[PDB]
mmCIF file of C-alpha atoms in Angstrom:
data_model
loop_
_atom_site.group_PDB
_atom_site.id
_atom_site.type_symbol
_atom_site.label_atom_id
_atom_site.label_comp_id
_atom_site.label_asym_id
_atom_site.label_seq_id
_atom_site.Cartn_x
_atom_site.Cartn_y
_atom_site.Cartn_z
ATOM 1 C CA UNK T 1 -117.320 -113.057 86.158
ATOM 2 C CA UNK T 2 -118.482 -109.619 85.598
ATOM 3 C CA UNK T 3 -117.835 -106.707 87.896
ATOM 4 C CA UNK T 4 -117.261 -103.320 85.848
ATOM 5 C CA UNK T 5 -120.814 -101.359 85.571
ATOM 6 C CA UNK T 6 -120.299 -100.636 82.089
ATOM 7 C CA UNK T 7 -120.524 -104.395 81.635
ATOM 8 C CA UNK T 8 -123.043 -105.393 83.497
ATOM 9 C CA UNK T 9 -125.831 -102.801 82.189
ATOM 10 C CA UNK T 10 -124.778 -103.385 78.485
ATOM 11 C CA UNK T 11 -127.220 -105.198 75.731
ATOM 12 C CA UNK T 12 -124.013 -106.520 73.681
ATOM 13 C CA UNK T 13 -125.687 -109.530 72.910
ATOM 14 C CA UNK T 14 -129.204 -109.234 72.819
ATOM 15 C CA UNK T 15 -130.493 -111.674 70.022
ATOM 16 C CA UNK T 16 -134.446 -110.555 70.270
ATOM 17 C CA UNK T 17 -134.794 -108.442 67.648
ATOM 18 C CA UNK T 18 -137.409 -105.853 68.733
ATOM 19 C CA UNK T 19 -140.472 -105.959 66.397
ATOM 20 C CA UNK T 20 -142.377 -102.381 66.059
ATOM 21 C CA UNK T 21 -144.938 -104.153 64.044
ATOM 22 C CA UNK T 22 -147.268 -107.593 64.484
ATOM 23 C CA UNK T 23 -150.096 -109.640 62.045
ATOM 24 C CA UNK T 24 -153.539 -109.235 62.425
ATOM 25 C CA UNK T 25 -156.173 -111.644 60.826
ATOM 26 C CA UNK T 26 -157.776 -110.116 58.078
ATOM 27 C CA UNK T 27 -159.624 -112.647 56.401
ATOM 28 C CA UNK T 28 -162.147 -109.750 54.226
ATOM 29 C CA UNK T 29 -161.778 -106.284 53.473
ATOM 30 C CA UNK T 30 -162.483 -103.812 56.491
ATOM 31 C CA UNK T 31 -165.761 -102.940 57.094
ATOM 32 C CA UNK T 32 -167.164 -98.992 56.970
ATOM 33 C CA UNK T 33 -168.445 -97.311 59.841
ATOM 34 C CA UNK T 34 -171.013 -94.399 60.065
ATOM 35 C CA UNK T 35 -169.996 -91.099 59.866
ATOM 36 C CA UNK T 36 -171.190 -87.658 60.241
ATOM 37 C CA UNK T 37 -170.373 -84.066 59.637
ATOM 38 C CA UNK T 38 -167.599 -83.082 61.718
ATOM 39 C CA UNK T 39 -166.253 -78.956 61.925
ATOM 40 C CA UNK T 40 -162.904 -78.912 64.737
ATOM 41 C CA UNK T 41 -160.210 -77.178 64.842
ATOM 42 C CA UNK T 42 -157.355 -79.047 65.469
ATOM 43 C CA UNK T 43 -158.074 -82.689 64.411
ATOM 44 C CA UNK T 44 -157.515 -82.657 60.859
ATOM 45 C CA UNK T 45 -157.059 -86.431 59.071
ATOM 46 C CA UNK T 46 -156.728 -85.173 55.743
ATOM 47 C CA UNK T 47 -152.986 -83.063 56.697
ATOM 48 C CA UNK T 48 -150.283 -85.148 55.985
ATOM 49 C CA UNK T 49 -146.176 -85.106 55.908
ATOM 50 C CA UNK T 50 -145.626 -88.038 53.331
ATOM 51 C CA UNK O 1 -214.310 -103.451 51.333
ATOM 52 C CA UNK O 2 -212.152 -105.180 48.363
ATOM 53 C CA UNK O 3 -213.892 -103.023 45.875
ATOM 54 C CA UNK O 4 -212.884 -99.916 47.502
ATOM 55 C CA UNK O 5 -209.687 -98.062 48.179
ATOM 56 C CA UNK O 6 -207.156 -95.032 49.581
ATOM 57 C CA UNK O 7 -203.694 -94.993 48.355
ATOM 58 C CA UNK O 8 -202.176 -91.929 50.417
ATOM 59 C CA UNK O 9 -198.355 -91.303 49.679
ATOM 60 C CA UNK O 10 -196.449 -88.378 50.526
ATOM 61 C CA UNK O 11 -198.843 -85.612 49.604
ATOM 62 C CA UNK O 12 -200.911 -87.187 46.950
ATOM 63 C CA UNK O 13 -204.006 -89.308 47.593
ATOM 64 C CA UNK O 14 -205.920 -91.990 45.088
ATOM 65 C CA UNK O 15 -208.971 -93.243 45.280
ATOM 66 C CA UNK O 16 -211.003 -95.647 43.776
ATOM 67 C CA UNK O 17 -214.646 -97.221 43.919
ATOM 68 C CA UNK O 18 -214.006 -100.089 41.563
ATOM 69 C CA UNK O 19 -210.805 -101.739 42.571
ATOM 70 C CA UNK O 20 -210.022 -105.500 42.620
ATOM 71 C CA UNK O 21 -207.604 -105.841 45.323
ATOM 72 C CA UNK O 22 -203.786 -104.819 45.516
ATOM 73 C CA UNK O 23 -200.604 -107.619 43.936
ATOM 74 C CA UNK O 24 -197.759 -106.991 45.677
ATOM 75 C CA UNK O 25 -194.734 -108.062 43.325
ATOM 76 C CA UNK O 26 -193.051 -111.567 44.271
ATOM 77 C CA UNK O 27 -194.924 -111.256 47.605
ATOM 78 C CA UNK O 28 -192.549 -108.370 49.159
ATOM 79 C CA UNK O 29 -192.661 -104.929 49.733
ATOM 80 C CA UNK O 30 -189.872 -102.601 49.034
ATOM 81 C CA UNK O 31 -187.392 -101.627 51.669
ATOM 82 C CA UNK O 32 -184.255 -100.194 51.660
ATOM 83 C CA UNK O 33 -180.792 -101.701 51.476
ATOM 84 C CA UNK O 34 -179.422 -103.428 54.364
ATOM 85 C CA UNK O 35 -175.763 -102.692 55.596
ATOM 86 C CA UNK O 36 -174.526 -106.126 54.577
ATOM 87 C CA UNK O 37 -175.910 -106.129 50.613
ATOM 88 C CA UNK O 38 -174.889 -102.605 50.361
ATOM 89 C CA UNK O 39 -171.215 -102.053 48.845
ATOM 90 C CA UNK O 40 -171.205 -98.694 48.313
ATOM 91 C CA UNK O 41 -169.519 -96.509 51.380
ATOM 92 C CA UNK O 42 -170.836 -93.008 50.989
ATOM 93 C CA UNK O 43 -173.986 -92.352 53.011
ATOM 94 C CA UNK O 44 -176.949 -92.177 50.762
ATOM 95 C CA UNK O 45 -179.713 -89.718 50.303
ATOM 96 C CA UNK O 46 -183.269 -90.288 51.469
ATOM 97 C CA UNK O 47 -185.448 -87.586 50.082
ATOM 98 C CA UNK O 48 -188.841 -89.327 51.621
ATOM 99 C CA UNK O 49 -191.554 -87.280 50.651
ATOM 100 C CA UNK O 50 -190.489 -85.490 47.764
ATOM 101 C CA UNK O 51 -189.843 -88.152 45.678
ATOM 102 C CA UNK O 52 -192.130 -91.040 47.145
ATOM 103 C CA UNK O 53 -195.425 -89.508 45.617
ATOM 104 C CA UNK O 54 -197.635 -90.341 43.121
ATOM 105 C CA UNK O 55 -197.284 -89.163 39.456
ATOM 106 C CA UNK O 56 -199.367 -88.958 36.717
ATOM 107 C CA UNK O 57 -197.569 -89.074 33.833
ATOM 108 C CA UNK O 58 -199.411 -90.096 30.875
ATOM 109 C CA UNK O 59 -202.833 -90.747 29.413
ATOM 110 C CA UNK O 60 -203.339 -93.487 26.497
ATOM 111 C CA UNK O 61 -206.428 -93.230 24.421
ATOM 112 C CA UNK O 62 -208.170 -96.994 24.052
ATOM 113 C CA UNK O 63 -209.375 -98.015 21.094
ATOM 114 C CA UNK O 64 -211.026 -100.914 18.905
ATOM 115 C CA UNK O 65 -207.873 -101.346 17.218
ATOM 116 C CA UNK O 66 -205.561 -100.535 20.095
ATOM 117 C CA UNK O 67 -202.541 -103.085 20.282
ATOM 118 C CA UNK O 68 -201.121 -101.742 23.428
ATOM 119 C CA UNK O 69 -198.743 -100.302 25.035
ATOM 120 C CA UNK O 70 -195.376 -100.519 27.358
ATOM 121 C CA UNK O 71 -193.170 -97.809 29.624
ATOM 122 C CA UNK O 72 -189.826 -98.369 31.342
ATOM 123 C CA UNK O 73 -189.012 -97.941 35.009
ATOM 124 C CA UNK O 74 -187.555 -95.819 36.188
ATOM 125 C CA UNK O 75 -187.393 -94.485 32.475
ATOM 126 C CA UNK O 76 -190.806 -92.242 32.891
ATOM 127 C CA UNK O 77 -189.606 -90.361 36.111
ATOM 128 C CA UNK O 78 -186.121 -89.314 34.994
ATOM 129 C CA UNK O 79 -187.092 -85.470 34.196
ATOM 130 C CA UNK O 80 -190.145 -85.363 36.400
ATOM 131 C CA UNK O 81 -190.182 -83.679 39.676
ATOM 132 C CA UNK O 82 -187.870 -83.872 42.429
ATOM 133 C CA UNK O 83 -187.235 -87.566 41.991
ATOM 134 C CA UNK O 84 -186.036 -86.558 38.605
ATOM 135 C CA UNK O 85 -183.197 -84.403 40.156
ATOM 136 C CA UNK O 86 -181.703 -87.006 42.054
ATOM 137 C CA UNK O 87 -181.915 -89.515 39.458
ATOM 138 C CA UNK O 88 -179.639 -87.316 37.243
ATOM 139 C CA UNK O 89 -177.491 -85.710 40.010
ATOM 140 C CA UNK O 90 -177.003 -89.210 41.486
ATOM 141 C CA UNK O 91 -175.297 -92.051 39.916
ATOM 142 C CA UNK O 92 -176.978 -94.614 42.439
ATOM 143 C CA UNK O 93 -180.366 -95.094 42.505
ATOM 144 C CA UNK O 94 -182.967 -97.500 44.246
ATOM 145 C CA UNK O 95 -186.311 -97.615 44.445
ATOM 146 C CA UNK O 96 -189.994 -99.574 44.412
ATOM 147 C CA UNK O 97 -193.006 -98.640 43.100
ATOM 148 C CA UNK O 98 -196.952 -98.384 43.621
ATOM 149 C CA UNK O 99 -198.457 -98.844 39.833
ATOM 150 C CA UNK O 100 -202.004 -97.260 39.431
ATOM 151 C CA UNK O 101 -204.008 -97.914 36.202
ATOM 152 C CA UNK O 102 -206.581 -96.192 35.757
ATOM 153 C CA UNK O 103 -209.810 -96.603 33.247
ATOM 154 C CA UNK O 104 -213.223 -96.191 33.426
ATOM 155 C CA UNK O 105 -215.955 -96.867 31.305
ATOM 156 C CA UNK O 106 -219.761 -97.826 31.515
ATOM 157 C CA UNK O 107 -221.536 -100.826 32.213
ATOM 158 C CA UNK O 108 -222.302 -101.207 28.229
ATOM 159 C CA UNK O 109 -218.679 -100.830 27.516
ATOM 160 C CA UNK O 110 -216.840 -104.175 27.790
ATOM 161 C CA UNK O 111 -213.148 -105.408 27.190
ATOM 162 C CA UNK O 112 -210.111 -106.279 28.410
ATOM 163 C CA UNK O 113 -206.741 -104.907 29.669
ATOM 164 C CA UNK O 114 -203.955 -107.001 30.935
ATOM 165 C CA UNK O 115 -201.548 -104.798 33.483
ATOM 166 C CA UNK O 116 -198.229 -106.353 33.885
ATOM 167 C CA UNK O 117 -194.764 -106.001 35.244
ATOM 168 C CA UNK O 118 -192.018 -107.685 33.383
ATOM 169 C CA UNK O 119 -188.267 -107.035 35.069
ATOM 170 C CA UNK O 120 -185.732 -106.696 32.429
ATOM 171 C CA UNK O 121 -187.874 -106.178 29.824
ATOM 172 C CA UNK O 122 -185.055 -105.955 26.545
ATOM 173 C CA UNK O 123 -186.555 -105.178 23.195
ATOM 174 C CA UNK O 124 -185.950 -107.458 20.438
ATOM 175 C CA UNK O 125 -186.446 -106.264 16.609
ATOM 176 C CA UNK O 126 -187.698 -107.898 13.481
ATOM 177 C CA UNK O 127 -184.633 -108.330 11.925
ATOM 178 C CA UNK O 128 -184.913 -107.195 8.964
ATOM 179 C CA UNK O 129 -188.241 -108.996 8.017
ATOM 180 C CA UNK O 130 -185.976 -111.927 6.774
ATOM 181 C CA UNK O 131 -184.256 -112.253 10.287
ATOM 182 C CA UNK O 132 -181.086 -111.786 7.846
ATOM 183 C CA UNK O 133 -180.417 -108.445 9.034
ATOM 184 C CA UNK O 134 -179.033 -107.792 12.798
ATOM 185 C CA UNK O 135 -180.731 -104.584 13.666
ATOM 186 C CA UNK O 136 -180.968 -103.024 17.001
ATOM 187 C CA UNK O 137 -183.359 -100.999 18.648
ATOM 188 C CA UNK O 138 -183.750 -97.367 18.791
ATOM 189 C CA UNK O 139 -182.977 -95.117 22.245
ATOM 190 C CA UNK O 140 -186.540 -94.278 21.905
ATOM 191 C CA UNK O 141 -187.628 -97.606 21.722
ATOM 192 C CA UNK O 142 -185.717 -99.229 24.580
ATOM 193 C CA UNK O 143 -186.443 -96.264 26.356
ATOM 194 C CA UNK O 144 -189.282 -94.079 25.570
ATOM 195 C CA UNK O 145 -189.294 -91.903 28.392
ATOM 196 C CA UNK O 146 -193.055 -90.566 29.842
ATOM 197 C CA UNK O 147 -195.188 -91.209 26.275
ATOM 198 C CA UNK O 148 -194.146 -94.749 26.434
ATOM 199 C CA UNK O 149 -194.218 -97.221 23.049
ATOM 200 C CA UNK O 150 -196.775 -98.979 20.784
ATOM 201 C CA UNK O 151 -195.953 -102.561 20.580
ATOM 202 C CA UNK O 152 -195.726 -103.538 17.008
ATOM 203 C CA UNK O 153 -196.241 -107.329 17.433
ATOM 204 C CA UNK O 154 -198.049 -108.235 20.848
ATOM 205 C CA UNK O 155 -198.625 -111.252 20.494
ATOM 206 C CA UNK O 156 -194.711 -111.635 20.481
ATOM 207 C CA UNK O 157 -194.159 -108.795 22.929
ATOM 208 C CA UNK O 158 -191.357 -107.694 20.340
ATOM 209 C CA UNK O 159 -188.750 -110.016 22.231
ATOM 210 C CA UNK O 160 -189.808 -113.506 21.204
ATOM 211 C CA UNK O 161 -191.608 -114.553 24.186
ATOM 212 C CA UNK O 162 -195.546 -115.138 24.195
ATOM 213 C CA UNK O 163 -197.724 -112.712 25.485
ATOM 214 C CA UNK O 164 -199.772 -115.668 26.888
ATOM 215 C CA UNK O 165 -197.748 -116.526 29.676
ATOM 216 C CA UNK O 166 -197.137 -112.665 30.861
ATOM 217 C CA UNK O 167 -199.408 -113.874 33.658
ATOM 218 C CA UNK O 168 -196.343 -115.401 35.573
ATOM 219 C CA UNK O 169 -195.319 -111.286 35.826
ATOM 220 C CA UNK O 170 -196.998 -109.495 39.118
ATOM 221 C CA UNK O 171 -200.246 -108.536 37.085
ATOM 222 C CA UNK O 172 -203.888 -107.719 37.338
ATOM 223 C CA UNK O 173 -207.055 -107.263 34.700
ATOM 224 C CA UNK O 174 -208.929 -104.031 33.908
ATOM 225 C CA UNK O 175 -212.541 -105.777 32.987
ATOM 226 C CA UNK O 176 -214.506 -103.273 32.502
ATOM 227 C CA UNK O 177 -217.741 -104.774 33.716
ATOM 228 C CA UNK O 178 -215.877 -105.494 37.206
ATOM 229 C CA UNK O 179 -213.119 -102.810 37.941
ATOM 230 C CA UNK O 180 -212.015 -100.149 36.805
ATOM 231 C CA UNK O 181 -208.097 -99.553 37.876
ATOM 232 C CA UNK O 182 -205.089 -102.020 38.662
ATOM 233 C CA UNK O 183 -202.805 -101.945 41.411
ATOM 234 C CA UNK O 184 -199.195 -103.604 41.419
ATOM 235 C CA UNK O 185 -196.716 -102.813 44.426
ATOM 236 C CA UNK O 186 -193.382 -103.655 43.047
ATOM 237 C CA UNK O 187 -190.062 -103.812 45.155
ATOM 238 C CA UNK O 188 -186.721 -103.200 43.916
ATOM 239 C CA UNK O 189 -185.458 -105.784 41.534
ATOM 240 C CA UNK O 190 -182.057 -106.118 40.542
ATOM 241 C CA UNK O 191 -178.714 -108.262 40.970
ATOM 242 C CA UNK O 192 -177.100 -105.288 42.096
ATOM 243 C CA UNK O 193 -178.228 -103.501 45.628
ATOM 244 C CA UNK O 194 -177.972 -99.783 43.793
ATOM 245 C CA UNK O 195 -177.984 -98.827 39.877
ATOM 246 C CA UNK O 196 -178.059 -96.316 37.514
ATOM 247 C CA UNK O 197 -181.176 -95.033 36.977
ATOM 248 C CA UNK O 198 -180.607 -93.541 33.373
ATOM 249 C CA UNK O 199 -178.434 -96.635 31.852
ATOM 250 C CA UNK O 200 -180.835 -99.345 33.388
ATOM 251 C CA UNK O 201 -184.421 -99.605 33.181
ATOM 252 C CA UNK O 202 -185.713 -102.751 36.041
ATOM 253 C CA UNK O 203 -188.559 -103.387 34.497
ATOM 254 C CA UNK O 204 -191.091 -102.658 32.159
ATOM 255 C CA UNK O 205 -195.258 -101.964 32.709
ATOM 256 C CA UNK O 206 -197.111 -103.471 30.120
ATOM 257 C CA UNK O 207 -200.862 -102.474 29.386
ATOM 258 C CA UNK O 208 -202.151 -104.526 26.727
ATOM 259 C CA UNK O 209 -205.641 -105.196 25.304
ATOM 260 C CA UNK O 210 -206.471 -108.945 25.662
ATOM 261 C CA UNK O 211 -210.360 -108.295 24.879
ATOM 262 C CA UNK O 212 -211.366 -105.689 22.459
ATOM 263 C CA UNK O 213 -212.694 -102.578 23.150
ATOM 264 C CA UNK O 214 -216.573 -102.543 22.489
ATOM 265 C CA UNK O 215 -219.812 -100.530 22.637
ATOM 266 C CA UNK O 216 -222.418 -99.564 20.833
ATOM 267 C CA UNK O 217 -222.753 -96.300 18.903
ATOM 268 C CA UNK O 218 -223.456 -93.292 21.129
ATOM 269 C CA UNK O 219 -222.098 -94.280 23.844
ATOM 270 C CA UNK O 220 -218.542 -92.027 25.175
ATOM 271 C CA UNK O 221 -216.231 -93.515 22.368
ATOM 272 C CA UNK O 222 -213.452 -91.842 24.016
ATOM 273 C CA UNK O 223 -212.058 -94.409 26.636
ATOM 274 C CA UNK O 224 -208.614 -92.819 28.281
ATOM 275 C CA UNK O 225 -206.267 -95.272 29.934
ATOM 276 C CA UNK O 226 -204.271 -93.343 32.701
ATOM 277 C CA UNK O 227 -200.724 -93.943 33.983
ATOM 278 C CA UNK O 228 -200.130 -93.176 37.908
ATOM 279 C CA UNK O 229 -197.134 -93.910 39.752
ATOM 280 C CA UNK O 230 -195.548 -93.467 42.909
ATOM 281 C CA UNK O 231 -191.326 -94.655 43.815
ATOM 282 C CA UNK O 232 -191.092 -96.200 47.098
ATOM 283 C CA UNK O 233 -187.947 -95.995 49.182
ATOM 284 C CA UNK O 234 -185.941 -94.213 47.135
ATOM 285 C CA UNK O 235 -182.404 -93.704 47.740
ATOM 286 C CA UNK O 236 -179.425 -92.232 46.270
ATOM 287 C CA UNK O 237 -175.959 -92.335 46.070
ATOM 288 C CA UNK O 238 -172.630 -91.372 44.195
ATOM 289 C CA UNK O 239 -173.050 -87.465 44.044
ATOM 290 C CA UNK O 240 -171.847 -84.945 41.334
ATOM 291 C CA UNK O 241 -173.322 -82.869 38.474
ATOM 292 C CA UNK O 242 -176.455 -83.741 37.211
ATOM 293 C CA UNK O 243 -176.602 -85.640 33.914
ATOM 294 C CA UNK O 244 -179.631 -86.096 31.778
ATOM 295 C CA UNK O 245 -178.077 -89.489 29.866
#
């Protein structure tokens, strides 16, 4: 048996690898959506930190 | 009430007392392109009025000996008007058209003139005479731009194919004793939804003489043949810089 806390709360032995990421279907290309001029401050898509 | 007719587009108006109905290409009228045969993401242009007018761009003189004549679409409105500046400063293009032929005459003056539409109209050449001799047509031959071309061999229609079956093209007859102007509505034909409208030409109009020119002396020997035109629908896509070729 277990009685220490240290123990009893640990994950030594968890075999379910934790996914972050799952499939989709995708059987064609994305579609495209409508658009429109768009002028905020803020919100900014095109800024990235590759 | 067949015989007579308004053709009011943007802000031009025709008009005509002599008419002989309206042929509207392969029984559709132009409309843009739907969201599903579309490929092309950026939103296109829609000028509307500015572009979808008519245009009177040339005037043919008819003669005895007249063999006839052919223009390219959308060839004859690349530098004309606004329409012109989005064909060059767009790479897409799409349109219809509203064809008006006009010639009048008197009721002594007789003769024929076929008006057809013929999509992908390529230009073939005589090959040397001997057919020996792979030549290839001129840029002002395959596209001649607001003066249009002479055919050399009608009968042929300098690609081959017999002028006497033209008739399966949207068409109409200027006989002089009955009317006096032709009328074709044609709607965007391609395999493509958009195109370029400086490296393709959709179709060609063909005005061709089936039944001489005739009248007796003193009668107006000068019998014009006009060329009016109006784009339908027009959009545009892909911009940048304009380009004249």
């Amino acid at each position: 048996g277990d009685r220490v806390a240290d123990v009893i709360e640990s994950s030594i032995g968890d075999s379910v690898s934790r996914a972050l990421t799952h499939a989709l279907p995708a059987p064609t290309g994305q579609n495209t959506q409508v658009s429109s001029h768009r002028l905020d401050t803020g919100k900014v898509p095109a800024l990235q930190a590759a | 009430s067949d015989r007579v007719a308004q053709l009011t587009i943007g802000n031009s108006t025709i008009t005509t007392q002599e008419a002989a109905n309206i042929i509207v290409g392969y029984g559709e009228w132009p409309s843009y392109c739907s969201d599903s045969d579309a490929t092309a993401v950026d939103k296109p242009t829609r000028p509307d009025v500015s572009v979808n007018r008519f245009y009177t761009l040339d005037t043919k003189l008819w003669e005895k000996s007249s063999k006839g004549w052919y223009w390219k679409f959308p060839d004859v409105l690349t530098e004309t008007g606004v329409f012109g500046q989005n064909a060059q400063f767009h790479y897409l293009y799409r349109s219809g058209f509203c064809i008006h032929v006009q010639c009048n005459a008197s009721k002594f003056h007789q003769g024929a003139l076929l008006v057809a539409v013929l999509p992908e109209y390529v230009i073939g050449t005589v090959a040397g005479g001997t057919g020996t001799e792979d030549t290839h047509p001129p840029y002002k031959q395959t596209q001649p731009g607001a003066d249009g071309f002479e055919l050399q061999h009608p009968y042929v229609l300098d690609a081959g194919i017999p002028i006497s079956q033209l008739t399966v093209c949207p068409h109409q007859w200027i006989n002089l004793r009955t009317n006096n102007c032709a009328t074709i509505i044609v709607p965007y034909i391609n395999a493509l939804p958009f195109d370029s409208a400086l490296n393709h030409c959709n179709f060609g109009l063909l005005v061709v003489p089936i039944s001489p020119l005739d009248y007796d002396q003193g009668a107006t020997p000068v019998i014009p043949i006009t060329i009016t035109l109006a784009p339908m629908c027009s959009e545009f896509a892909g911009l940048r810089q304009a380009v004249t070729q």
